[PDB]
């Protein structure tokens, strides 16, 4: 409201160029081309009417594409997890038993994926829903490298998620994931990215989650007027850099990816979901997957599958590595800052 650091205070208002650009156009002149040569409220609500006029007398500011979905609360819990997590949409699981009959190699149990998925519906009930990312880490927790922080993921899920026997949801869905790779229906063929959390609506057995399917993060008016701010949080088992592991320490915008690792063995099949931060082209990424993860190459068609997730627009991108609280549980959480979401498609194996 017109302060006196004016040249910045007018600069934050959306300039002098728009005044000078309308000066030669509109402020001067008749040229373009011419001839030659009622005590407490009202005025409380009355200035609120004027606030609508203040909303109408005027109106950078980035854009979004907010999305909503009516979502069952079996697998994910938008109440237990705070605003600012990853989310994952799914295909409808009636396509699961038929595609396993044609994509699984000969000699493998194609009945296994339809049976393992059916046991999950009777275990979370003691309809294409949504998988939250923290729930997915405890499922693939039995394949990682840092196993203690994967148990820190498992420490809060069994105590904060709504439902009965959340550990039985975990150990059955992890059995579903071991039935995914065995029936060759890869989880990247099912897991689809759905935007980062901003808010949700509570209801019995289902929740209406809002999310940004494309755009930046922190300037969404969350609904809370004190804090329209919510940082992106990732557990420490999934956060993988390629600036430190490849000695690329230069500044530049850092991309964010999702990466699946596949190990194809007889009834011992591993799954690991990683969030890869990089300064690389997405076409200049598959060679970097060859250098690191050649161990799952031999034990297996590719072992890797990946897609874009978002971009950090910072010159020197800033990350945090803290221990936050999901209720009473201290989890080592990699908090990311300033993320501009742009999704993409997965990449192939067979």
């Amino acid at each position: 409201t017109k302060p006196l650091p004016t040249a910045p205070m007018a600069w934050a208002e959306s300039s002098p160029r728009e005044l000078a650009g309308h000066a030669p156009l509109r402020r001067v002149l008749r040229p373009p081309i011419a001839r030659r040569d009622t005590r407490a409220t009202r005025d409380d609500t009355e200035q609120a009417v004027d606030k609508i006029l203040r909303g109408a007398r005027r109106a950078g500011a980035p854009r979004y594409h907010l999305t909503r979905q009516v979502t069952l609360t079996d697998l994910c819990q938008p109440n237990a997890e705070r605003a600012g997590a990853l989310l994952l949409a799914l295909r409808h699981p009636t396509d699961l038993p038929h595609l396993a009959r044609h994509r699984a190699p000969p000699g493998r149990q194609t009945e296994r994926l339809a049976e393992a998925w059916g046991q999950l519906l009777e275990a979370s009930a003691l309809r294409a829903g949504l998988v939250s990312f923290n729930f997915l880490v405890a499922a693939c927790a039995a394949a990682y490298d840092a196993r203690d922080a994967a148990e820190a993921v498992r420490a809060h899920i069994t105590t904060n998620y709504g439902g009965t026997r959340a550990g039985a949801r975990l150990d059955r869905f992890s059995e579903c994931l071991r039935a995914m790779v065995h029936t060759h229906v890869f989880p990247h063929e099912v897991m689809r990215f759905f935007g980062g959390l901003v808010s949700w609506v509570t209801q019995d057995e289902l929740a209406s989650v809002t999310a940004v399917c494309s755009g930046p993060q922190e300037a969404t008016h969350t609904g809370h007027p004190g804090r329209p701010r919510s940082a992106v949080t990732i557990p420490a088992c999934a956060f993988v850099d390629l600036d430190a592991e490849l000695c690329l320490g230069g500044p530049g915008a850092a991309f964010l990816y999702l990466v699946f690792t596949y190990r194809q063995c007889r009834d011992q099949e591993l799954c690991c979901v990683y969030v890869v931060k990089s300064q690389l082209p997405p076409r200049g990424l598959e060679a970097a997957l060859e250098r690191l993860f050649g161990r799952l190459r031999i034990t297996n068609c590719t072992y890797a599958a990946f897609a874009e997730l978002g971009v950090m627009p910072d010159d020197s991108p800033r990350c945090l590595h803290r221990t936050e609280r999901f209720g009473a549980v201290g989890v080592p959480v990699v908090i990311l800052e300033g993320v501009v979401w742009r999704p993409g498609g997965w990449r192939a194996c067979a």
Partner: protein, 384 residues
């Protein structure tokens, strides 16, 4: 204009302006935009007292930004002067050479490179070496002061004492040295000095060009060109005449606290900046520099004939009845490591430079020697 002295018997300088740009980042946060913009405002004082908190966060940041520029200059200068500055040890030979001879005989060029090396080796770090003495160091300071020839510019105003005596230049050291000098080796003969305030400006004689919209073609309309010229050239003088009228008008000198030392014949600002500027930032004080030296240690060489001997008879005697490891060709070294260790460096470390398959790559040589056609010598032992 070079001095020229009449002997018996039979000029413009053009320098390129360096150019640089200095940066700072001011950034805000969404939280405080809504307030400053006026958007999130309510009638509640709480909504209001949330502004003032986020109005002041500009004042704090703006100042700490604008401030970073006056510290920017004070930084650049030290970073600049270091690049005008030949080290002493290399000068005093030069100034003796340029003043006297300034002559192109190859021997002259040659006799420097003798004087340079040996001056440098000896006088490089002076206060570390001769520091205990005094009449030396009192004469070393006097060399700094006289090594530079005065410069061309004559400033509009001149930094001076309280008394008004002018000031001829600026020592800049670390504080560790400054404390040292101010005890034994110097005296501070003034406290407050007078310093100019206003910057300069420029007088503009430019190339004056016109693009003038015109409606109709006639002499007056055309003469307006000639007219608008004079109008425009009449304007510059009015611009310039203000500046001179401004520079004479503005306040000029103020009182400032800084140290004035009399060295030899000349007063000098003696100052050490690491507090005012470089204290409590991530920037190193540029005046703390670096060195590269390279050393040569021989390993297995062997004494000449005259030089194999012993300074006495029984000098270094193995226990009676035992061999003398002295008399063998030596394969090792010994020298002083960093912290006062006795290191050991022997042949067996050479493996990495020798056992490598490279030493059997001849092929550059054979081709490289045979570029020039070589004659046919007696081929008595080269032929089977």
């Amino acid at each position: 204009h070079q001095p020229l002295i009449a002997r018996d018997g039979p000029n413009y300088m053009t320098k390129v302006i360096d150019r640089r740009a200095l940066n700072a980042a001011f950034s805000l946060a969404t939280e405080a935009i809504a307030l400053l913009t006026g958007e999130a405002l309510d009638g509640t004082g709480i909504s209001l007292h949330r502004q003032l908190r986020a109005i002041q966060q500009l004042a704090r940041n703006v100042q700490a930004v604008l401030g970073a520029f006056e510290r920017g200059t004070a930084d650049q200068m030290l970073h600049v002067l270091l690049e005008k500055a030949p080290p002493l040890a290399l000068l005093l030979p030069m100034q003796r050479y340029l003043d006297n001879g300034r002559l192109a005989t190859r021997v002259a060029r040659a006799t420097l490179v003798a004087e340079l090396k040996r001056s440098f080796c000896d006088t490089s770090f002076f206060l570390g070496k001769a520091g205990h003495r005094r009449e030396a160091i009192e004469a070393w300071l006097v060399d700094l002061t006289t090594a530079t020839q005065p410069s061309v510019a004559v400033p509009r105003l001149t930094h001076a004492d309280t008394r008004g005596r002018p000031v001829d230049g600026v020592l800049v050291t670390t504080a560790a040295i400054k404390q040292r000098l101010l005890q034994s080796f110097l005296k501070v003969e003034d406290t407050e000095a007078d310093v100019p305030v206003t910057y300069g400006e420029m007088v503009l004689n430019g190339a004056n060009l016109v693009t003038a919209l015109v409606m109709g073609k006639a002499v007056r309309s055309l003469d307006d060109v000639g007219r608008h010229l004079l109008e425009m050239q009449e304007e510059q003088l009015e611009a310039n005449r203000e500046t001179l009228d401004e520079l004479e008008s503005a306040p000029q000198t103020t009182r400032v606290r800084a140290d004035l030392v009399a060295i030899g014949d000349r007063l000098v600002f003696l100052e050490a900046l690491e507090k005012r500027i470089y204290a409590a930032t991530n920037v190193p004080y540029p005046l703390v520099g670096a060195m590269d030296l390279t050393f040569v240690l021989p390993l297995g060489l062997f004494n000449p004939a005259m030089e194999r001997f012993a300074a006495h008879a029984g000098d270094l005697v193995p226990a009676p009845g035992h061999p003398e490891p002295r008399a063998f060709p030596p394969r090792q070294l010994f020298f002083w490591g960093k912290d006062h260790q006795v290191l050991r460096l022997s042949m067996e470390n050479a493996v990495g430079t020798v056992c490598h398959p490279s030493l059997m790559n001849i092929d550059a040589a054979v081709g490289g020697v045979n570029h020039d056609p070589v004659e046919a010598a007696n081929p008595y032992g080269a032929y089977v």
